[PDB]
Amino acid sequence: ATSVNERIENKRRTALLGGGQRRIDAQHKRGKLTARERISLLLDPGSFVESDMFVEHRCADFGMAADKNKFPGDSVVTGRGRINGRLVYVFSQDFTVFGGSLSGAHAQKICKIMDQAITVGAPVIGLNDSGGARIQEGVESLAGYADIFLRNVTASGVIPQISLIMGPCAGGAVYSPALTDFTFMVKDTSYLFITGPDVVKSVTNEDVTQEELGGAKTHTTMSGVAHRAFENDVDALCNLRDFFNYLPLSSQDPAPVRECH
Amino acid sequence: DPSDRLVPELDTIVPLESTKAYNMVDIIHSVVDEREFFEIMPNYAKNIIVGFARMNGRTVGIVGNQPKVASGCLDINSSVKGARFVRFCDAFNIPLITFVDVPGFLPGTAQEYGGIIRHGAKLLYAFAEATVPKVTVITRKAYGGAYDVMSSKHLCGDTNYAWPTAEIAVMGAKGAVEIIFKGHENVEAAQAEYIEKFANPFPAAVRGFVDDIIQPSSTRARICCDLDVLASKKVQRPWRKHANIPL
Amino acid sequence: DPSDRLVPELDTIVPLESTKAYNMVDIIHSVVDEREFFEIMPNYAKNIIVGFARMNGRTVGIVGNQPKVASGCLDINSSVKGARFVRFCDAFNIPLITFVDVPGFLPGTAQEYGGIIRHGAKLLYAFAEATVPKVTVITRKAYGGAYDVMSSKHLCGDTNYAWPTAEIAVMGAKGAVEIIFKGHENVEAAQAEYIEKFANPFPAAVRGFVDDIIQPSSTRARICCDLDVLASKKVQRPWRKHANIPL
Amino acid sequence: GSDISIYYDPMISKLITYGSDRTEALKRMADALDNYVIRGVTHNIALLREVIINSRFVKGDISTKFLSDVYPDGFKGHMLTKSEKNQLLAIASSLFVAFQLRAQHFQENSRMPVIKPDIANWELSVKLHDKVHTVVASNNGSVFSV
Numbered sequence: 099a100t101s102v103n104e105r106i107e108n109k110r111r112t113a114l115l116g117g118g119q120r121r122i123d124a125q126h127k128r129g130k131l132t133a134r135e136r137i138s139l140l141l142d143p144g145s146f147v148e149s150d151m152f153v154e155h156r157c158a159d160f161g162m163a164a165d166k167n168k169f170p171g172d173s174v175v176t177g178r179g180r181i182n183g184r185l186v187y188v189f190s191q192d193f194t195v196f197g198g199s200l201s202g203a204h205a206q207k208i209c210k211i212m213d214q215a216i217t218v219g220a221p222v223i224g225l226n227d228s229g230g231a232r233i234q235e236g237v238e239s240l241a242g243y244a245d246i247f248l249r250n251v252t253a254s255g256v257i258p259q260i261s262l263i264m265g266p267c268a269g270g271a272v273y274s275p276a277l278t279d280f281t282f283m284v285k286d287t288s289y290l291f292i293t294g295p296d297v298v299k300s301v302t303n304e305d306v307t308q309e310e311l312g313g314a315k316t317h318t319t320m321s322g323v324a325h326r327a328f329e330n331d332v333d334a335l336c337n338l339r340d341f342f343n344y345l346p347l348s349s350q351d352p353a354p355v356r357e358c359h
Numbered sequence: 360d361p362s363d364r365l366v367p368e369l370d371t372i373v374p375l376e377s378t379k380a381y382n383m384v385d386i387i388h389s390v391v392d393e394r395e396f397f398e399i400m401p402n403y404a405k406n407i408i409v410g411f412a413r414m415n416g417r418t419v420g421i422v423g424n425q426p427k428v429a430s431g432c433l434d435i436n437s438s439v440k441g442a443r444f445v446r447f448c449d450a451f452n453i454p455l456i457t458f459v460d461v462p463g464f465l466p467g468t469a470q471e472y473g474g475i476i477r478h479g480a481k482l483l484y485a486f487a488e489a490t491v492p493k494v495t496v497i498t499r500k501a502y503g504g505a506y507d508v509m510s511s512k513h514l515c516g517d518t519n520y521a522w523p524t525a526e527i528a529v530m531g532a533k534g535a536v537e538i539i540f541k542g543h544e545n546v547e548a549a550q551a552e553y554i555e556k557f558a559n560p561f562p563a564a565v566r567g568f569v570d571d572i573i574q575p576s577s578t579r580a581r582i583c584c585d586l587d588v589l590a591s592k593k594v595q596r597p598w599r600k601h602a603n604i605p606l
Numbered sequence: 607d608p609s610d611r612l613v614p615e616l617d618t619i620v621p622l623e624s625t626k627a628y629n630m631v632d633i634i635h636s637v638v639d640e641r642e643f644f645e646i647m648p649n650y651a652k653n654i655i656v657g658f659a660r661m662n663g664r665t666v667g668i669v670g671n672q673p674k675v676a677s678g679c680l681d682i683n684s685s686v687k688g689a690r691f692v693r694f695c696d697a698f699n700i701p702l703i704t705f706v707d708v709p710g711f712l713p714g715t716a717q718e719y720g721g722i723i724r725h726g727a728k729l730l731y732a733f734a735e736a737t738v739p740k741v742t743v744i745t746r747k748a749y750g751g752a753y754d755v756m757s758s759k760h761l762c763g764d765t766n767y768a769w770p771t772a773e774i775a776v777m778g779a780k781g782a783v784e785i786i787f788k789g790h791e792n793v794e795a796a797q798a799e800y801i802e803k804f805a806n807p808f809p810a811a812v813r814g815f816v817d818d819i820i821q822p823s824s825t826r827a828r829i830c831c832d833l834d835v836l837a838s839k840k841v842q843r844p845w846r847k848h849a850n851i852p853l
Numbered sequence: 854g855s856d857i858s859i860y861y862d863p864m865i866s867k868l869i870t871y872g873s874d875r876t877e878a879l880k881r882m883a884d885a886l887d888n889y890v891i892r893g894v895t896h897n898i899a900l901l902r903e904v905i906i907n908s909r910f911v912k913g914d915i916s917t918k919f920l921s922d923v924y925p926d927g928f929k930g931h932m933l934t935k936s937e938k939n940q941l942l943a944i945a946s947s948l949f950v951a952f953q954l955r956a957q958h959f960q961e962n963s964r965m966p967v968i969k970p971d972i973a974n975w976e977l978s979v980k981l982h983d984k985v986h987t988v989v990a991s992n993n994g995s996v997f998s999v
């Protein structure tokens with residue numbers, strides 16, 4: 099009689115929900131979906147293979163060693179799937195767990211999935227919804243950001259990289275989408291700024307809202323950072339799925355050719 | 360969609376007078392497969408149109424000027440938006456089709472103080488280093504250095520076409536006669552000869568700057584065949600770690 | 607043989623107690639296509655099994671530990687045989703599937719005088735330099751450096767799985783408690799904690815050293831898909847005439 | 854390529870059908886009016902099609918105020934029946950499934966082979982007007998069971 103077998107599905111259930119049902123309800127109330135259902139809506143049915151399901155952060159300072167702060171998965175879902183039968187490597191950030199903040203394990207999973215994608219020669223798709231670097235981790239978050247930036251630069255021109263911002267992305271989390279090939283946004287629910295409105299008001303003495311400072315309209319109309327903005331989450335996933343069919347899987351392949359009528 | 364489909368509604372889309380504008384998205388829809396066009400940055404720098412479409416089932420990148428917005432002039436935002444898209448298309452073996460209708464660059468002190476030269480160089484370099492097949496169609500006009508920036512034949516372009524309404528000129532007729540004929544004080548005839556001799560695609564076609572002058576209704580059938588023969592295009596360039604983008 | 611053929615017979619093939627042994631060739635037969643397996647050196651160094659099989663019609667090289675004889679411990683002959691087979695499989699673009707159930711290298715002065723270190727280095731190099739896709743499944747245990755020598759994830763492995771009855775540790779609980787806990791002079795709480803927290807595959811999973819913990823009945827269906835993705839794997843290494851095998 | 858301007862009459866065209874009797878003429882009018890393609894402007898083909906297949910028009914009793922009284926509030930369109938609604942939903946679902954299936958027909962790569970999905974039945978939610986319908990579509994070639 100061993101409890102490890104029970105612990106398997108115990109941690110599986112804790113990972114599937116993420117950071118709890120209450121935060122999922124809050125996410126739905128905000129008009130946004132969770133990472134897992136976003137992935138299910140993006141990929142072909144019955145084709146998602148997830149990697150590093152049981153990975154937790156290594157932080158042991160400032161109370162993060164407590165059992166209540168240990169979430170299996172660590173605010174990111176990473177894996178591979180297929181769109182219209184074509185292989186793709188996908189990661190989606192989970193705002194439920196610590197606001198999507200990137201810890202050491204988060205960046206480790208992203209770097210691993212990017213490394214596998216660049217080894218096999220497949221595109222990378224990232225659903226971005228994160229509050230920035232995790233302060234509790236410390237310089238580990240900066241190291242993870244730098245590793246992701248280095249992999250983004252190395253993979254530039256080798257495999258296509260698509261980033262879809264689906265929430266308020268602040269701080270370092272804004273540089274990775276800028277290094278990717280294309281940037282898409284969701285109206286009224288996605289933001290992209292380096293510093294928040296409070297810091298702007300405190301420093302520059304100016305009143306500005308989140309939507310005005312880094313909203314989808316601002317970045318798709320007068321900034322030139324994002325490429326397209328979509329009505330909501332489902333429309334964004336549908337349009338991204340349609341757009342993925344245009345691009346080749348790698349720079350070693352010719353332009354895709356389809357059937358004409 | 361058949362590759363040799365005729366597209367007759369483009370025969371008179373370009374107005375006879377040069378002071379009236381049209382929509383380039385109409386031409387793009389009429390030319391591409393099933394009239395389906397995934398436009399990139401549709402609400403930013405509207406005086407240029409970039410996007411992804413399909414020709415004979417093969418994905419292609421479309422870059423064009425928009426005479427409806429800002430008379431089709433080029434500026435900083437349009438230059439950057441076109442340049443990055445062209446660079447991405449070249450990087451992943453995606454053919455490029457360009458539609459040219461531009462009077463030049465947008466003048467003013469705001470453009471000069473913002474660094475219009477750097478971004479124009481960005482766009483010119485983006486079209487210059489491309490090794491993917493490039494097909495260019497001139498609809499109404501291409502004046503001055505913009506004609507070079509819009510994937511001319513001399514940038515190692517593959518095929519260049521001009522509609523009967525095309526006007527490949529150094530600059531505007533009035534400025535040309537005012538800089539050539541200074542003391543002639545008889546511009547009344549000079550306008551007649553200059554318009555009759557240089558306000559047409561003939562100066563460019565007489566020296567092979569455009570492959571042919573094609574009827575608009577045969578545009579699509581002209582492009583697809585080219586994309587059939589240029590799929591095996593392969594050129595070589597001097598070795599380097601990388602180049603110096605004018606960012 | 608369908609690529610998603612479920613294999614429930616592997617659900618309870620691993621005995622609960624760690625002192626009972628099972629047959630590794632049963633897992634090989636149940637996993638591979640049509641249960642056909644061409645073994646190499648079946649009667650020499652029988653604590654390891656190597657051979658050729660087919661997965662989804664593609665030829666695969668299979669190396670695994672046999673816990674029936676010598677409890678699966680590695681030695682000179684086993685290391686040499688496995689290293690040679692792995693080198694041949696890597697040299698001819700044949701993917702490798704590894705099944706890991708090993709407690710380490712068996713002790714004795716005959717192994718030390720014969721050069722067990724050199725042959726362990728043989729096999730470690732053989733898995734280290736391989737650039738073919740490698741799929742590793744840990745069945746029961748992987749203790750100490752042998753776990754590294756058996757195509758671990760850190761050794762440029764492609765995909766690593768662990769069964770729910772797997773366990774990865776530096777060595778057994780007894781030696782670890784003896785070398786760590788000496789001043790407590792009590793094993794009532796130390797042994798219980800070590801068994802409950804370091805006698806299960808969770809330390810390897812939480813650090814990300816195994817991709818997933820899978821049910822045994824989904825083994826084959828899991829491997830085939832991995833062999834479909836990893837077909838186009840390509841890596842680059844520094845130039846050299848050759849390397850020094852520790853022969 | 855022809856354009857409609859504010860200066861002249863809005864007359865797009867003049868369609869005529871001839872048959873042995875009135876019923877054949879009306880059938881030919883319907884057939885030729887369903888196969889007439891205009892894209893770019895707004896036409897009154899819907900009004901003509903609804904008027905032609907009108908029961909009162911078929912019977913014969915018409916007057917100069919025939920258009921005024923049959924649509925007191927105004928023109929609304931074709932009030933399609935239950936069978937026609939089912940046919941329209943089936944056609945739309947089949948077209949959607951056909952587009953989705955065509956989206957998967959890539960050329961052979963020889964380096965990254967594709968694995969075409971094997972969806973047997975497509976389960977769809979179709980919103981028409983202000984009603985949601987559940988549709989199950991299956992394909993076995995050029996034939997769709999909806």
Ligand SMILES: CCC(=O)SCCNC(=O)CCNC(=O)[C@H](O)C(C)(C)COP(=O)(O)OP(=O)(O)OC[C@H]1O[C@@H](n2cnc3c(N)ncnc32)[C@H](O)[C@@H]1OP(=O)(O)O
Pocket residue numbers: 196197198199228229230231232233266267268269270271294
């Ligand atoms: C430049 C390189 C770097 O180091 S960037 C580091 C990030 N810098 C910052 O200033 C963080 C600012 N974050 C924010 O302002 C908000 O969280 C934003 C991102 C605007 C979210 O907006 P909103 O939709 O209202 O959600 P919320 O504020 O209720 O947040 C809910 C939970 O998320 C958490 N969260 C968010 N970010 C972090 C973070 N970096 N580290 C740790 N936790 C974070 C919040 O603590 C919050 O927790 P709780 O559920 O309210 O208890």
Ligand SMILES: *C(=O)CCCC[C@@H]1SC[C@@H]2NC(=O)N[C@@H]21
Pocket residue numbers: 860861862
């Ligand atoms: C105006 O540009 C068109 C002249 C033809 C219409 C004239 S005027 C009104 C009459 N009614 C009709 O159908 N033709 C006549």
